[PDB]
Each structure stands twice: as C-alpha cells, then as structure tokens.
C-alpha cells in the first residue's frame, strides 16, 4: 500500500524512559501509531474504498498486487475515531467509540520516528510499565507485548509498501494472522472470506507470521505472561490455513507456536493473587507495576509493585516444578500436565531467545476476543472442563461471558491505561 493524505497523520506523543545499570532513568520522547487494519484504504487518486465493511472492492482489488497498486492507507483521528488518547507518559485505549462509525478497540506501536517503530532487544533487560485494568471486565484484554516487526513496517523488504511504519504497516504474530488487509507490500483480497460474526474483519488467503512476547494480557480478573517461538524468527508471510491460529480450520501451523508457555498464576492454582477488592494481593481497582526481566539464560522473571509494595511472581508446583520462574523446566512441565506440544515443537526458550536478542517491536492493544470469548484467558477453557480438571480454570468469570457483541453493549466505556513505561538492564527500572 501506499499512503495518501485525505486525513491528516499525526502519532500521539508518549514519553517513556530508558534505565542504566547504576542508578539513572531519561525520558525518552516517543510516540504512538495505529495498526494499518483500522484505517481507511481507498483508491491513490479518489475517495473510492478499496474495503468496504467486510468486503473487497473487486473493481480496485481483482487480485493482490492490482490492490496494492490502486489502493492507500490515510490518516486517523486517534481520539475522536479510536478513543486512543495520551498524557505525558499515559496512554489510554478505549473500547467502544462512537463516531459516523463504531470502533472497536485499537492496536498500536511505540515510533522511534515519524517513520519507524521502536526496536528492543528484550534479552539482559527488564521491561517495568504500569497499568490500570480496573475498567476491564470479563472478555477485554488490555495487551503490551512484544513482536518480531521490521522497523520500517515492511518498506525495505516490500517496496511496493511505500506506506511504511508511518501508518501501521507490517504486524505479525505467533497467530499468523490473516486478517491483515496488507501483507508483504501487497493486498490480501485473494481468497477473502469475509467474518460471519463481525460486519468490519475478515480471514485472507495469507497471513503474517513471527515470534511474540506476551508480556500482559490481562483484565480485572486474569492475567496471563506468554512467550511464543517461530521457526521463522522475523515476519514471515504464511499461506491459508499454513497459518494456523483460531481463525485457521486448525490452529496448529506450520511456523509459530500459537499457545505460548503461559503463565497465569490463577490457572496454576493461585486463586487469591490478582483480582477485584481487599481479598486479593493484587488489586485491581487500583493502578499497577508489572516488571519482567529477560535473564541472559532465556528465562524470564516477573514481579509486580503496588502502592510502593513488591511482590514477586507467586509459587507454582505443576509436576515435578516449583517455582516462580518461566523457565523450559516451567515449559516442560506445563506440556506434561496440561497437555500439549507446540511451543517444544516450535523450539521452546532457546528459539524463543533468537527473537528476544533480537529487535522487537513494543504493541499496545485493547480487544475483544471474536474466536473465543477470550474465555482462555479468565474463565473455564475449554467450557466442558471442571476445577477438578488442572489448569482448565483460568480466571473466575462466567463460561457464556465475553460475547463480542454482549461485552460491546454492555462496557462500551472499558478502557486500559498504560503508563510509565521504563526499560533498561535487569535491575535497574527502580532507579528515580
Ligand atoms: C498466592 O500468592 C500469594 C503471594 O505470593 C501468597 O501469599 C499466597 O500464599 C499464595 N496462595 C497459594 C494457595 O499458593
Ligand atoms: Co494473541
Ligand atoms: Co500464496
Ligand atoms: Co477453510
Ligand atoms: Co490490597
Ligand atoms: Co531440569
């Protein structure tokens, strides 16, 4: 794609700030841009759309390179059609807004420039941010993580995509995503199936894959930790259900682990940690501090800070472990308890630490879950299990919760806040 300028681009300002080993933190003057899926693609030389609701303009759009050609990504009006606004170091994320159109949710990346995103090397540091869940009920996830995004958004390997990081070009994710409209500087308007459940997405005949760090998906109620390998480390274009994830006929492709190592304390059997009120060490009514620290080994580390308190990850015994650690002894025997095989398939935290030495790219999201309910991550997954099934249990929230159209009606003003980023070696994001 290329960009046009019908509306004007503009990335909100985010200060966050680097950390060094010996005590200092400078603020750094970022920004934010929305993911290239939310904008509007017309025609370079009119206002003609190249996607209307869940549909292809096939005069535009008869074939992927045609598309790409004839097609443009414009401007966004981040507060007035995305509920993206920021302060400061705070960025707020609404759910529901209500403009000519409904929006729902946003996907978006920390810029280094007008031009590029923001590349970490996760591995020997420790990413600290604060967060305030309370306004996400039962089927939101407010998420910051990491992926394997090239800087520019794909320009230098895709010449064709001329649009670039400016305007949100290039995701991937251990999902392999298909429901990306641009994919490798070129249309995914082949094999379009528009979605049955949602009047603005559809799955394409490509998707777009690469490794993934689950830093923080999370609600009032549940909140998971969730690093996901590739044999491919960097984004990589995947073909049809190739791809795998929820919206594939079999989630298991060929490439990403799309499950994850997960780290849920509440699945792991940690009921008390994190939740709404006084009964729970983590309360979330009120704003927190998530540090999580990449070990030089490949390990990772966690602990959470309230109101000036540390708490470090809680224990967990899951078969032959004990520990607080996410480590491939953790991943080893969460494959021998709960089942599974993808993530040791896909390589585990040794092809996991290609990407984590590597740059990543720094994603904030809110969504709603249009596979699941979001169900996996704060209620009984799959729903036919029991509390006497070992990590069925996710969260306290209700089987039939969740509903997109549901949750959309009835919290339209959820949002997350995130705030306070700070990044620096392991040990060093409490410095002033
Ligand atoms: C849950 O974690 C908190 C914080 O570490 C701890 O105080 C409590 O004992 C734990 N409960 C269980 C059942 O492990
Ligand atoms: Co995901
Ligand atoms: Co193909
Ligand atoms: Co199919
Ligand atoms: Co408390
Ligand atoms: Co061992």
Request: with cysteine; glycine share 12%.
């Amino acid at each position: 794609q290329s960009a046009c300028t019908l509306q004007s681009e503009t990335h909100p300002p985010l200060t966050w700030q680097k950390c060094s080993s010996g005590g200092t933190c400078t603020q750094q003057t970022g920004s934010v841009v929305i993911d290239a899926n939310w904008r509007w693609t017309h025609a370079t030389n009119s206002s003609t759309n190249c996607y209307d609701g869940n549909t292809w303009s096939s005069t535009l759009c008869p074939d992927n390179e045609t598309c790409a050609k004839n097609c443009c990504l414009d401007g966004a009006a981040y507060a007035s059609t995305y509920g993206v606004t920021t302060s400061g170091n705070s960025l707020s994320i609404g759910f529901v807004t209500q403009s000519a159109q409904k929006n729902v949710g946003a996907r978006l990346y920390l810029m280094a420039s007008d031009t590029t995103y923001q590349e970490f090397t996760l591995l020997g540091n420790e990413f600290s941010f604060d967060v305030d869940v309370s306004q996400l009920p039962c089927g939101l996830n407010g998420a910051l993580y990491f992926v394997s995004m090239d800087a520019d958004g794909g320009v230098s390997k895709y010449p064709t995509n001329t649009a670039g990081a400016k305007y949100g070009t290039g995701y991937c994710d251990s999902q392999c995503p298909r429901d990306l409209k641009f994919i490798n500087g070129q249309a995914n308007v082949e094999g379009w199936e528009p979605s049955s459940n949602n009047a603005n997405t559809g799955i394409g005949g490509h998707g777009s894959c690469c490794s993934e760090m689950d830093i923080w998906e999370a609600n009032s109620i549940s909140e998971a930790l969730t690093p996901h390998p590739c044999t491919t480390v960097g984004q990589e274009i995947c073909e049809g259900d190739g791809c795998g994830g929820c919206y594939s006929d079999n989630r298991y492709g060929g490439t990403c682990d799309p499950d994850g190592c997960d780290w849920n304390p509440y699945r792991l059997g940690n009921t008390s940690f994190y939740g709404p009120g006084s009964s729970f060490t983590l309360d979330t009514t009120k704003k927190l501090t998530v540090v999580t620290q990449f070990e030089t080994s490949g390990a990772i580390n966690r602990y959470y800070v309230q109101n000036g308190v540390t708490f470090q990850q809680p224990n967990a015994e899951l078969g032959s472990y004990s520990g607080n650690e996410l480590n491939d002894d953790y991943c080893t025997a969460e494959e021998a308890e709960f089942g599974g095989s993808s993530f040791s398939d896909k390589g585990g935290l040794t092809q996991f630490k290609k990407a984590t030495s590597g740059g990543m790219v720094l994603v904030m999201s809110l969504w709603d879950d249009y596979c699941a309910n979001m169900l996996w991550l704060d209620s009984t997954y799959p729903t036919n299990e029991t509390s006497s099934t070992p990590g069925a249990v996710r969260g306290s929230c209700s089987t039939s919760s969740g509903v997109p159209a549901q949750v959309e009606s009835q919290s339209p003003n959820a949002k997350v806040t995130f705030s306070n980023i700070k990044f620096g070696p392991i040990g060093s994001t409490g410095n002033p």
